[PDB]
Design an enzyme around this catalytic site. Structure first.
Site, PDB file in Angstrom:
ATOM      1  CE  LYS A 343      50.922  28.215 108.966  1.00 54.27           C
ATOM      2  NZ  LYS A 343      49.721  27.577 108.369  1.00 54.27           N
ATOM      3  CB  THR A 344      56.557  24.081 110.024  1.00 49.54           C
ATOM      4  OG1 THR A 344      55.419  24.528 110.771  1.00 49.54           O
ATOM      5  CG2 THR A 344      57.703  23.794 110.978  1.00 49.54           C
ATOM      6  CG  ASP A 397      57.057  24.946 114.960  1.00 54.20           C
ATOM      7  OD1 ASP A 397      57.044  25.238 113.746  1.00 54.20           O
ATOM      8  OD2 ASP A 397      56.746  23.815 115.389  1.00 54.20           O
ATOM      9  CG  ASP A 398      51.796  26.981 115.829  1.00 53.68           C
ATOM     10  OD1 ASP A 398      51.223  28.023 115.451  1.00 53.68           O
ATOM     11  OD2 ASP A 398      51.449  25.842 115.454  1.00 53.68           O
ATOM     12  CE  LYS A 425      59.612  47.603 120.570  1.00 50.41           C
ATOM     13  NZ  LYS A 425      58.898  46.593 121.400  1.00 50.41           N
ATOM     14  CE  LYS A 502      50.717  17.734 108.758  1.00 52.23           C
ATOM     15  NZ  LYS A 502      50.301  18.168 110.118  1.00 52.23           N
TER      16      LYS A 502
END
Ligand SMILES: Nc1ncnc2c1ncn2[C@@H]1O[C@H](COP(=O)(O)OP(=O)(O)OP(=O)(O)O)[C@@H](O)[C@H]1O
Ligand SMILES: Nc1ncnc2c1ncn2[C@@H]1O[C@H](COP(=O)(O)OP(=O)(O)OP(=O)(O)O)[C@@H](O)[C@H]1O
Ligand SMILES: Nc1ncnc2c1ncn2[C@@H]1O[C@H](COP(=O)(O)OP(=O)(O)O)[C@@H](O)[C@H]1O
Ligand SMILES: [Mg+2]
Ligand SMILES: [Mg+2]
Lengths: 534, 125
Positions: A343-344, A397-398, A425, A502
């Site tokens: 995902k990164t 990132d996480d 927001k 990975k």
């Protein structure tokens, strides 16, 4: 009247800010240009200070010095914020007091005919009982501020001073320091634009052009368009780096080859030095950083299936929506999938392809041992920096590691969660856009915390779920032979494969540690042992 | 007159009856708080599902009152604060409100001021 009616600001140093002078002069200094007779007849007082704020290194001190020069004032008494601070009781007040002695003396002697004394502050927000509201301890023994006020006004009146304050954090300024009769004119010195960069580059390179040192190859418009979000000081740094690189190259070349004196005398800098320095020397603080992308996309992107194209196209659509649109200047998105799905890398690719001027990545790799308050400060600083550009893009990132989530308990930090919920927001100042990209592997926990209601969209990143996909991935990677591929296909036709990219790379690397005979069986055993069944 | 134009970002269009009902109720409350003698303090709470338009209607009701003092207390100007700082800020706003002869205060997103989270639950007492 001591200055021409329309004033003049050009080829005198400050070159980028030409509209600012007119604005400030119209708003503040209208009394000092009109004939003194009419001003005294009206019976009015002058403004007793102003405030300037903006990003660092954008030409604020030059503006103050030129303003002082144009009013026919004495030498400015420069001072710094953190310098006026001492732990001993009743010592900072003394430092604040020593600054006004000359004005008092001249007022005592000459009466109402004395000149003008200007005091230039710097980082004035250092002394303020408002930073203490934020989590920390910088109470600065509030008394200090009061003393300053007691010198700008009070029972004893001083009528021959002018205080110019400069700051970078306009939201930590004490509110009592902005009422009428005190610093009462605010102004903004933002980043330059194309014309400003062109003018600054023209000014800073005027010396060489006089002595024919600069080559005829170099332009100034090309270097003005190449630099996107450069500030004032970075252009000077670029020029200095170009000088040094050209000199070093010339001396090395002359040493290597016994060139005749004709070229030895010449020390042309050419254009190659400028480009090399620009692409290798200067790293802007408000611009893109091409070095960090290679730290996340280490092996590139390979197309093993359809989903990759789907994700990339959706990212392109989101970028297009955020770029040219009104009624919606803030857009968010979230990428979710199982661990080791990659995902990164996809988020970094989507951000890179956007071509925005300001790209940043906020990851927990740089927050080891930080307390939650420090994490909040860093996140807020990144967003504050993002708010100072026309187009921006931020990546988180996480989200699970930023909260310190552990299934036992459960346990996490509430301060960071609330800060994120508030920041997701909050639209930027008028006329500016923003884009945010998330990433996480635990969607259920985020949903249970009412955080999935703040984002605007969601994307899914799947794994390899068919044999032919694995074969195509191996073919693109190129690590197994022909008969090897035949054996792998024969043994993996069962279709019971569920792996991440990975993990697949790690398994291939581990399997390739033996002699060519036994690679296939080792790899197949490792793959089989990982027999997941969702 | 800069907060109202910052919170009502796209005006107020009338898609149905309920808007009129809400505005009329607000007007009646304003008239009561102005003309009464034995009830100087009044309060009201606006509730509904998320993304329903609660803040815009509250800001419109406040703006259409013509009171000489008006203030809005939102949580987005207290990012990173601690509990004591929040208490001091709210108390300061109310203390300023007490020095006028006619005032109105808007408290926005009461659930974000207490730091509520369904897990736990956790919040500020
Ligand atoms: N199509 C692809 N998509 C994603 N990553 C790919 C692809 N092809 C190769 N890679 C490489 O695979 C690795 C992906 O690992 P990545 O850091 O993105 O995993 P992750 O999902 O963030 O893992 P974690 O659960 O540890 O956070 C990177 O080296 C990336 O270069
Ligand atoms: N009749 C209307 N009522 C309310 N808002 C309207 C109306 N017509 C247009 N709008 C616009 O719709 C948006 C309403 O969003 P608003 O900020 O009021 O949401 P909210 O109820 O506070 O949401 P949240 O649950 O996220 O706190 C504003 O842009 C408002 O200008
Ligand atoms: N508008 C500008 N035009 C020319 N040079 C500038 C400009 N702004 C900044 N500089 C350069 O930046 C340096 C001074 O920065 P300074 O005026 O101290 O800004 P700040 O106070 O924001 O740090 C000098 O190299 C000066 O030539
Ligand atoms: Mg990751
Ligand atoms: Mg709201």
């Amino acid at each position: 009247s001591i200055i021409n009616p329309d004033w003049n600001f050009e080829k005198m140093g400050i070159g980028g800010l030409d509209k600012e002078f007119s604005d400030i002069f119209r708003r503040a200094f209208a009394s000092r240009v009109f004939p003194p007779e009419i001003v005294e007849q009206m019976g009015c007082k002058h403004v007793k200070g102003i405030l300037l704020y903006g990003p660092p290194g954008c030409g604020k001190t030059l503006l103050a010095r030129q303003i002082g020069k144009m009013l026919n004032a004495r030498e400015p008494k420069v001072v710094n914020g953190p310098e006026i601070l001492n732990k001993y009781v009743g010592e900072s007040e003394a430092n604040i007091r020593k600054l006004f002695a000359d004005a008092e003396e001249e007022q005592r002697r000459l009466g109402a005919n004395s000149g003008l004394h200007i005091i230039i502050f710097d980082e004035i927000d250092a002394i303020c009982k408002q930073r203490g509201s934020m989590a920390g301890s910088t109470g600065v023994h509030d008394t200090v501020v009061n003393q300053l006020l007691s010198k700008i006004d009070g029972v004893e009146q001083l009528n021959n001073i002018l205080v110019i304050g400069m700051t970078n954090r306009p939201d930590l300024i004490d509110e009592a320091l902005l009422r009428p009769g005190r610093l009462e004119v605010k102004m903004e010195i933002g980043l330059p634009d194309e014309k400003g960069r062109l003018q600054i580059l023209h000014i800073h390179t005027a010396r060489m052009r006089g002595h024919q040192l600069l080559s005829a190859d170099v332009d100034i418009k090309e270097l003005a368009v190449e630099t996107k979000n450069f500030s004032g000081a970075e252009l000077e740094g670029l020029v200095r780096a170009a000088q040094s690189t050209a000199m070093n190259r010339h001396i090395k070349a002359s040493t290597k080859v016994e060139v005749d004196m004709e070229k030895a005398e010449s020390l042309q800098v050419t254009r190659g030095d400028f480009l090399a320095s620009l692409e290798n020397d200067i790293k802007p603080a408000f611009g893109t950083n091409q070095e960090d992308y290679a730290s996340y996309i280490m092996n590139g992107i390979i197309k093993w299936g359809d989903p990759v194209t789907r994700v990339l196209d959706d990212g392109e659509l989101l970028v297009q929506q955020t770029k040219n649109s009104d009624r919606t200047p803030l857009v968010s998105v979230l990428l979710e999938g199982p661990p080791h799905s990659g995902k990164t890398a996809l988020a970094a690719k989507i951000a890179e392809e956007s071509n925005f001027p300001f790209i940043k990545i906020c990851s927990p790799d740089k927050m080891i041992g930080f307390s939650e308050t420090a994490k909040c400060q860093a996140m807020k600083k990144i967003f504050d920096d993002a708010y100072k550009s026309q187009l921006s893009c931020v990546v988180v990132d996480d989200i699970e590691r930023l909260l310190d989530y552990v299934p036992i308990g459960p346990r996490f930090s509430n301060l960071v969660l609330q800060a994120l919920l508030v920041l997701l927001k909050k639209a930027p100042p008028q006329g500016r856009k923003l884009l945010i990209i998330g990433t996480t592997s635990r969607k259920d926990v985020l949903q249970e915390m009412e955080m999935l209601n703040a984002f605007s969209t969601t994307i899914h990143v799947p794994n390899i779920a068919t044999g032919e996909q694995l074969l195509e991935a191996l073919e693109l990677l190129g690590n197994f032979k022909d008969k090897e591929r035949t054996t792998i296909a024969q043994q993996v036709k069962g279709k019971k494969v569920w792996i991440g990219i990975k993990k697949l790379l790690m398994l291939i690397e581990m399997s390739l540690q033996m002699d060519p005979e036994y690679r296939v069986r080792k790899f197949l055993a490792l793959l089989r042992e990982e027999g997941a069944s969702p």
